[PDB]
Design a binder for these strands. Structure first.
Ligand SMILES: [Mg+2]
Ligand SMILES: [Mg+2]
Ligand SMILES: [Mg+2]
Ligand SMILES: [Mg+2]
Ligand SMILES: [Mg+2]
Ligand SMILES: [Mg+2]
Ligand SMILES: [Mg+2]
Ligand SMILES: [Mg+2]
Ligand SMILES: [Mg+2]
Ligand SMILES: [Mg+2]
Ligand SMILES: [Mg+2]
Ligand SMILES: [Mg+2]
Ligand SMILES: [Mg+2]
Ligand SMILES: [Mg+2]
Ligand SMILES: [Mg+2]
Ligand SMILES: [Mg+2]
Ligand SMILES: [Mg+2]
Ligand SMILES: [Mg+2]
Ligand SMILES: [Mg+2]
Ligand SMILES: [Mg+2]
Ligand SMILES: [Mg+2]
Ligand SMILES: [Mg+2]
Ligand SMILES: [Mg+2]
Ligand SMILES: [Mg+2]
Ligand SMILES: [Mg+2]
Ligand SMILES: [Mg+2]
Ligand SMILES: [Mg+2]
Ligand SMILES: [Mg+2]
Ligand SMILES: [Mg+2]
Ligand SMILES: [Mg+2]
Ligand SMILES: [Mg+2]
Ligand SMILES: [Mg+2]
Ligand SMILES: [Mg+2]
Ligand SMILES: [Mg+2]
Ligand SMILES: [Mg+2]
Ligand SMILES: [Mg+2]
Ligand SMILES: [Mg+2]
Ligand SMILES: [Mg+2]
Ligand SMILES: [Mg+2]
Ligand SMILES: [Mg+2]
Ligand SMILES: [Mg+2]
Ligand SMILES: [Mg+2]
Ligand SMILES: [Mg+2]
Ligand SMILES: [Mg+2]
Ligand SMILES: [Mg+2]
Lengths: 132, 208, 177, 328
RNA sequence: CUGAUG
RNA sequence: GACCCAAACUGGGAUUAGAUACCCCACUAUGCCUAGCCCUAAACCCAAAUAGUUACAUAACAAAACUAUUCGCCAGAGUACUACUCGCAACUGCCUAAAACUCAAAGGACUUGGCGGUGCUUCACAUCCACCUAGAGGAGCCUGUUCUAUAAUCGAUAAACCCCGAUAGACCUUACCAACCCUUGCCAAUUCAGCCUAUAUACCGCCAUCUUCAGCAAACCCUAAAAAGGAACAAUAGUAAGCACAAUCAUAGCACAUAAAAACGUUAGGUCAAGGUGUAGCUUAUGGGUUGGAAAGAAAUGGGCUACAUUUUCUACAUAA
RNA sequence: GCGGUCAUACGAUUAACCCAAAUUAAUAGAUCCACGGCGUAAAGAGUGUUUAAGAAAAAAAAUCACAAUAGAGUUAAAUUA
RNA sequence: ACAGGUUUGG
C-alpha cells in the first residue's frame, strides 16, 4: 500500500490540514508546490543548491518557531531575493514575534549572501479541512 | 480497443450504396443506420474497395505473415499466384485441344477450390470423462473449417519442404495437388475423418 | 384475532359481526380525547398504511391542519427522532390509526413506537387487529370505503370544532381583561 | 445557516465592487464573465482540476441548497407531511395524484356528456423532451432522493401524461421536462475555393499514427498525385500503400477526374498512407454531393484512426507482455 | 473413476 | 427338508504406492419350511402409565407450557455396553454391574467467520476448458542464485526471491580479510565522540500480496436479550457524517483505452545496511586511518541475447537487383 | 496459571496489606447432593399381565369398514431346471 | 451461602 506523504485515517476525530488531506499523486492537480524556483526547469542549473537551502530553511524555522507553526513554509525565489511565507499560531506575543522575525531576516541574509524577506500570517488555530 | 462499443463496422462494398433504390428492405435499415448517431470505425489498411482482392487471400496472407513482415507475406502470395499461373499455362500449352477446355488457369478459383477441398467436415474435441480424454466428434463452424484448411496447408508447406525449394514454389505444387485431391493435406483431412469415424460411438459424450 | 372476541356480536355464516353498541361507546371516548388534545394545542398524526385511502387521509389531515403518514414508516422515526427528523423536534401528542395492520398484515411499527415513547394512540381496529397497545380502540370496519370515510369525517369535524371552540375561548379571554 | 449566507452575499457584493474598481471596468456592467476573467489574471493558479482554482461567485452557487426551517417557535411543523421524512417529495407525489384524480373525474364527466375536446399532447419527439434525472430532481427538492421513489414518480408522470390533458396540467408536467444537444453527427462541408484563377480547389487534413498529411485537390485536372514533390509511384513502392490511395478515389469513381498534391510528414509508410488517405477523403467531400459523403463516412473514410501505440509500463516489456512469472 | 499427509 | 434369486466369507478382474474396500463376475454359510434354543437393536416417536387444563408463562433447538396418583431411573468426565459376583438350554454369550488411576473439566444448544472432492443459478475474456500466436526446459554466451573452495562481506531467498538492493564492484565505492598506526579521536563544549554490533519478533519512514475485492467505520435507534443481527419498493427497523469504490484529474478536443488511485486489515511479509531510532552490548576497541588481496568451478538452476537457416546469408539499396 | 531479554506471579531489596505471641503448611473434621430432574446434557428401563403396596378425593364409559395372530388350501407378474 | 474463580473464538 502507498504510504508516502499519506496521513492514515483514524476513527474520525483527527484534524488534518488541506496539504495533508491530499495524497502526493494530487500535486499540481488539486494542490501545488510549497516552493517555487527556476532550478527545476529544463535548461537551468543550480538545483541542488536550492534544494539544500530549502531543506535548511525548513529545519531552521521548525526550531525557530517551536510548536507555534501551523503548516509548512512557502519558499518563493524571485530575482535574487528569497521570500519565506509562514502560518504561525498566536501563542507568542508580538513583542517576541518581531524579535524573531528581525533576527531571522538578518541571520538568513548573512548566511546565504542574499536578501531574504520573512512574512508571517497568524491564525487563531490550525485550519481544519477534512473531518475533525 | 480504443473504439467504444457504439462504434459499428464499416461497409466497404460500393455496389451496396450505388443502388439503394432497387430494394425496400435495405432502405429501412440504411436510412436509420445514420439517424441514431452511430459512429463508424476507420477502415483497415488491409481491406479496401479493390475488386482484385479477396478476404480469403487476405486471411491466407495474414496467416503466412511472420511477425510483421507484411510486405514479405504479400510478395510470397503474389509469387505463389504467378507460379501457379505459369505452371497452369505450361500444361495448357502442352495439352491438346480436348483438355484445353477443361484445364483452368484462373488462380483465384483454383485457390478457393483447393481450400474447399481441404476444408474438413467434422472435427475432434477432447472431453475429459472418467479421468481420460476422449476425442469426441463435433461439427465444426465455418470459420474453424476454413482456418484449419489454411493452417494445415501452411504447416505442411513450411516444414515438409527442402531448404533449396522456396515458399511459392512449394505452395504452387501443393495448391494444384489439393485442387486435384491428391495432396497430403487431403490425406490429413481423410485421417481426421477416419479418426472421427472410429470415435463416432463416443458422440454421446457431447452435451451441446 | 384472539383479542377481538369481547368486541364481537357474533358470526353471520363465517363472517364475524362487530357489535355497534360498544363501537359507539368507544368512539365517543375516542372523539372526546382527540377533541381535547386538539383543543390543548396538540400535534395529531393520522397514520395508516393502506394503499386505497392514503390520498383521502392526506386530504383529511390537510383539511384538519394536522399531520399525516400514509407512506412507508421508517425505522427510527419516533424513537430516533432527533436524528431522523431534526436536531430538536416535537413528537406528536396523538396518533390516530386508520389502519392498524400494514400491507404485510402485521401490526404497524408506530403502534409499538408510540407505546414506547408514551404517546396516546387512538386506533380503528378490525376483527384481525391487536388492540392490546392501542390506548383508545374503536372496534369497526376499516376496509369499506364508506366505513373509512365515516371515521375520517368524524375526526375531521372533531378537530374543526375543537380548534374553533379554542379560538372562541381565546376571544372571551381577550375580553376578560 | 440562514444568516451566514446573507452576510456572505453582502461581502460578495462588496468584493465585486472592489474587483471592478481594481480591474478598472465599470462596476455596473461587471458580470460573471468578467469576474472569473479577473480572478484568472489576479490569481493565476496552474492546476489540472478546475474546482481547485480560486473562484468567487454568488454564494448561492457555492453553498448548497440549505433546508428551510420546518417548525415554528411553538414546535408545530409547517407542512402537513413533515413526519414522513421526505416532506417535499411526498408532497409532490400527493399533488401529482390529486391532479390525476381531477383529470380522471373531469374526463369521466366529459365522457358522460359525450364531448371530446382534448388531444394527444404527450408525443414531444420533434421538440426533444426528456424526463428529469435523479440529480435534477435532487436540485429541485432540497432533500435527498433514492432510486425507487424517483422511478415511482416518473411512472406516475407517464400515467398522468397518458390521460386526456387539461389546461393547467400541461404546464405542471412540462416543468419536469428537459430539452436534449444536437443529435446530428453531420460534418461541416468545406465550400469550393478558387485561388489564383484556379477552379475546383479544395483542401483536407488527415492524421493517423503520428503522421500529419495535408492534401490539396484540383477537380479540373487529370488523375495523378504529387507528394513531397515526387510522384506516388516512387513515394509508395509497396502496392498496399498505393491501394490505400486508390481506396477513397475508387469509392467515388473519380480516378481520372482529379489532380492532387499532398504533403505528409512523420510516421512510417503505412501511417503516411493512412494519413494521406484520411486527408484525401476529407478533401474530396467538397466535390461530391451530400448523399455520397455520408457513404464515405459509413465506409470509413472520414473518420480518424485512434489506434496509437500504448506507452510501455514499468516492470513489463511491451506495455502488455509481462515478465516470465516463476511460480516457485 | 481416482486423489494421502502437515 | 427346500434352494429360483440375493448374498457374509472366499476366489478371480479392475483402480491404487498399497486396496486383504468402494466397481464387475462366480459361489458358500445365510435369508425359505418343522421342531427346539439364543432374548439383543438408533427394540427411538430418544418424549412412562392413568384422568385432565389452556390458567402463569418463550434458557436455546426440537414435538408449546403444565397439573393430580403412581412406578422405573439419574449424584462430573474417562476408565466402563469393563473386572469380579448371582442367575440363565446361552461356554468368543446375555443380565446385573464397580474400583484403582488421570483431568478440571466432560457435555447440550446457539452466534459469527472459515472451509466444503454438497446442491442450484450467474460467470471467467488472456482465462479454466473448447481454440490462436510467440517462447522457456535442448546449444553457446551474459547475468543472478544454491553448492563445493579460500583469510575474505551482508540482506532477499513460496505466490510476493533469483539483470533482486545495484538506473551498476580495478584503488574509493566496500560495511570483508591479512599486515601495519591513532586512541576526549569531524563538531563550540560535554566522565565525551564514534559502532554498517544484536534485535525488522519494538519502530518510524518506504513497499510487496489479497487488490480494480468492495468493504471499513464514529454517532444513534430496534430486538419478549442482544454471542449477534438489522432487508422486502404494491416495502416487514433502520437513519448514518467520514474513509474506500465511483466521479474528476493526466496522456493538451470529445468517447474508449491506458496511466494514476485502491480504505480497514492478513502474511510478527522485506528493509536496524537510505536515514533516525526503543532495548541490550563496544570505548588503547565490535571505534578511526594506509597498503595488498577478496580467487576458482566438481556441479545444479532462474531470467535474458544469439542462432539452429530458405519468410535464409552477404553486397548496393526503401522493399522490382 | 506464571517463567524463552523491560517477570507487580521465580530469588533478593524497598514499600505496602492482613494477622499477631502467634503465623503459615498438611491432615482430619463441622458445613455441603435431590421435596431437583429424565426429547437434544445422567436419567421413561423393548412389550403386556399379575402379587405386595398405593390412589379411587365431582360425574361420565364399555364393541365395530381396512394389513392382529395361529392353522389348512390356492397363485397373477417375473425367474429358472 | 448474599456467594466468587474455573469448560469455550464467543
Ligand atoms: Mg380490516
Ligand atoms: Mg515486444
Ligand atoms: Mg444356498
Ligand atoms: Mg449371485
Ligand atoms: Mg478381490
Ligand atoms: Mg422399531
Ligand atoms: Mg430410550
Ligand atoms: Mg410404567
Ligand atoms: Mg434468541
Ligand atoms: Mg465415576
Ligand atoms: Mg450389548
Ligand atoms: Mg459383559
Ligand atoms: Mg495464459
Ligand atoms: Mg527467441
Ligand atoms: Mg537453454
Ligand atoms: Mg550474496
Ligand atoms: Mg538470509
Ligand atoms: Mg513470500
Ligand atoms: Mg583498500
Ligand atoms: Mg574493493
Ligand atoms: Mg566497522
Ligand atoms: Mg515485519
Ligand atoms: Mg457499498
Ligand atoms: Mg448491532
Ligand atoms: Mg454512510
Ligand atoms: Mg480529457
Ligand atoms: Mg472511464
Ligand atoms: Mg496501476
Ligand atoms: Mg478511482
Ligand atoms: Mg519476519
Ligand atoms: Mg529477514
Ligand atoms: Mg542504524
Ligand atoms: Mg543487521
Ligand atoms: Mg548459469
Ligand atoms: Mg527480472
Ligand atoms: Mg528484570
Ligand atoms: Mg499468589
Ligand atoms: Mg516474589
Ligand atoms: Mg444435580
Ligand atoms: Mg440421554
Ligand atoms: Mg418407550
Ligand atoms: Mg436396552
Ligand atoms: Mg407355521
Ligand atoms: Mg430345481
Ligand atoms: Mg466444552
Amino acid at each position: 500500500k502507498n504510504r508516502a506523504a499519506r496521513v492514515r485515517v483514524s476513527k474520525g476525530d483527527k484534524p488534518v490540514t488541506y496539504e495533508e488531506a491530499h495524497a502526493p499523486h494530487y500535486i499540481a492537480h488539486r494542490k501545488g508546490w510549497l516552493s517555487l524556483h527556476t532550478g527545476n526547469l529544463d535548461g537551468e542549473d543550480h538545483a541542488a543548491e536550492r534544494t539544500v537551502e530549502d531543506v535548511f530553511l525548513r529545519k531552521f524555522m521548525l526550531g525557530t518557531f517551536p510548536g507555534c507553526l501551523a503548516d509548512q513554509l512557502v519558499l518563493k525565489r524571485r530575482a535574487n531575493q528569497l521570500e519565506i511565507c509562514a502560518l504561525v499560531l498566536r501563542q507568542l506575543p508580538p513583542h517576541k514575534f518581531y524579535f524573531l522575525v528581525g533576527y531571522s531576516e538578518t541571520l538568513l541574509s548573512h548566511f546565504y549572501k542574499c536578501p531574504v524577506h520573512l512574512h508571517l500570517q497568524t491564525v487563531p488555530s490550525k485550519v481544519v479541512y477534512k473531518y475533525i | 480497443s480504443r473504439y467504444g462499443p457504439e462504434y459499428k463496422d464499416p461497409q466497404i462494398d460500393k455496389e451496396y450504396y450505388r443502388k439503394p433504390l432497387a430494394e425496400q428492405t435495405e432502405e429501412e435499415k440504411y436510412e436509420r443506420d445514420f439517424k441514431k448517431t452511430q459512429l463508424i470505425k476507420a477502415a483497415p489498411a488491409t481491406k479496401t474497395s479493390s475488386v482484385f482482392e479477396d478476404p480469403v487471400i487476405s486471411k491466407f496472407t495474414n496467416m503466412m505473415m511472420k511477425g510483421g513482415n507484411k510486405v514479405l507475406a504479400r510478395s510470397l502470395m503474389t509469387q505463389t499466384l504467378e507460379a501457379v499461373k505459369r505452371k497452369q499455362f505450361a500444361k495448357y500449352h502442352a495439352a491438346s485441344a480436348e483438355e484445353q477446355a477443361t484445364i483452368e488457369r484462373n488462380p483465384y478459383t483454383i485457390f478457393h477450390q483447393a481450400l474447399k477441398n481441404c476444408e474438413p467436415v467434422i472435427g475432434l474435441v477432447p472431453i475429459l470423462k472418467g479421468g481420460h480424454f476422449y476425442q469426441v466428434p463435433v461439427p465444426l463452424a465455418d470459420r474453424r473449417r476454413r482456418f484449419l484448411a489454411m493452417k494445415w496447408m501452411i504447416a505442411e508447406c513450411r516444414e515438409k519442404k527442402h531448404r533449396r525449394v522456396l515458399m511459392p514454389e512449394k505452395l504452387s505444387q501443393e495448391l494444384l495437388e489439393a485442387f486435384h485431391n491428391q495432396g497430403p493435406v487431403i490425406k490429413r483431412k481423410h485421417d481426421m475423418h477416419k479418426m472421427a469415424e472410429a470415435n463416432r460411438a463416443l458422440a454421446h459424450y457431447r452435451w451441446w | 384475532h384472539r383479542f377481538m372476541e369481547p368486541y364481537l356480536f357474533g358470526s353471520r355464516l363465517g363472517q364475524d359481526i362487530i357489535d355497534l353498541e360498544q363501537t359507539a361507546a368507544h368512539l365517543q371516548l375516542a372523539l372526546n380525547f382527540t377533541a381535547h388534545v386538539a383543543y390543548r394545542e396538540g400535534i395529531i398524526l393520522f397514520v395508516s398504511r393502506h394503499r386505497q385511502f392514503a390520498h383521502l387521509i392526506e386530504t383529511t389531515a390537510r383539511d384538519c391542519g394536522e399531520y399525516a403518514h400514509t407512506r412507508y414508516f421508517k425505522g427510527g422515526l419516533l424513537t430516533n427522532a432527533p436524528l431522523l427528523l431534526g436536531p430538536g423536534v416535537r413528537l406528536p401528542d396523538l396518533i390516530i390509526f386508520l389502519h392498524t395492520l400494514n400491507n404485510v398484515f402485521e401490526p404497524h411499527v408506530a403502534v409499538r413506537d408510540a407505546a414506547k415513547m408514551n404517546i396516546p394512540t387512538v386506533g380503528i381496529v378490525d376483527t384481525n387487529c391487536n388492540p392490546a397497545l392501542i390506548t383508545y380502540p374503536v372496534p369497526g370496519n376499516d376496509d369499506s370505503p364508506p366505513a373509512v370515510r365515516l371515521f375520517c369525517r368524524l375526526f375531521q369535524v372533531a378537530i374543526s370544532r375543537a380548534k374553533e371552540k379554542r379560538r372562541q375561548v381565546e376571544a372571551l379571554y381577550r375580553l376578560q381583561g | 445557516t440562514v444568516d451566514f449566507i446573507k452576510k456572505q452575499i453582502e461581502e460578495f457584493n462588496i468584493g465585486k465592487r472592489h474587483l471592478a474598481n481594481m480591474m478598472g471596468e465599470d462596476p455596473e456592467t461587471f458580470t460573471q464573465e468578467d469576474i472569473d476573467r479577473a480572478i484568472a489574471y489576479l490569481f493565476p493558479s496552474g492546476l489540472f482540476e478546475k474546482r481547485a482554482r480560486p473562484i468567487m461567485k454568488h454564494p448561492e452557487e457555492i453553498f448548497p441548497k440549505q433546508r428551510a426551517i420546518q417548525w415554528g417557535e411553538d414546535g408545530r411543523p409547517f407542512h402537513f407531511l413533515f413526519y414522513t421524512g421526505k416532506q417535499s417529495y411526498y408532497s409532490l407525489m400527493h399533488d401529482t395524484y390529486g391532479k390525476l384524480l381531477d383529470v380522471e373525474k373531469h374526463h369521466n364527466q366529459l365522457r358522460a356528456k359525450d364531448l371530446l375536446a382534448e388531444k394527444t399532447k404527450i408525443l414531444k419527439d420533434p421538440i426533444g423532451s426528456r424526463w428529469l434525472i435523479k440529480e435534477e430532481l435532487e436540485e429541485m427538492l432540497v432533500e435527498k432522493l433514492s432510486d425507487q421513489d424517483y422511478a415511482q414518480f416518473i411512472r406516475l408522470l407517464e400515467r398522468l401524461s397518458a390521460l386526456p390533458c387539461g389546461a393547467t396540467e400541461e404546464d405542471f408536467v412540462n416543468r419536469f421536462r428537459r430539452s436534449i444537444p444536437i443529435q446530428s453527427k453531420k460534418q461541416l462541408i468545406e465550400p469550393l475555393q478558387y485561388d489564383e484563377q484556379g477552379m475546383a480547389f479544395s483542401r483536407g487534413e488527415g492524421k493517423r499514427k503520428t503522421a500529419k498529411a495535408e492534401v490539396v485537390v484540383y477537380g479540373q485536372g487529370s488523375g495523378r498525385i504529387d507528394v513531397n514533390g515526387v510522384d506516388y509511384l516512387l513515394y509508395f513502392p509497396v502496392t498496399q500503400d498505393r491501394e490505400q490511395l486508390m481506396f477513397p478515389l475508387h469509392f467515388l469513381d473519380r480516378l481520372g477526374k482529379h489532380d492532387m498534391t499532398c504533403a505528409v510528414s512523420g510516421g512510417g509508410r503505412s501511417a503516411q498512407a493512412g494519413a494521406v488517405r484520411l486527408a484525401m477523403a476529407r478533401a474530396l467531400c467538397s466535390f461530391v454531393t451530400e448523399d455520397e459523403v455520408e457513404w464515405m463516412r459509413q465506409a470509413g473514410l472520414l473518420t480518424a484512426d485512434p489506434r496509437v501505440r500504448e506507452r510501455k509500463k514499468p516492470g513489463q516489456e511491451g506495455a502488455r507482455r509481462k515478465f516470465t512469472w516463476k511460480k516457485r
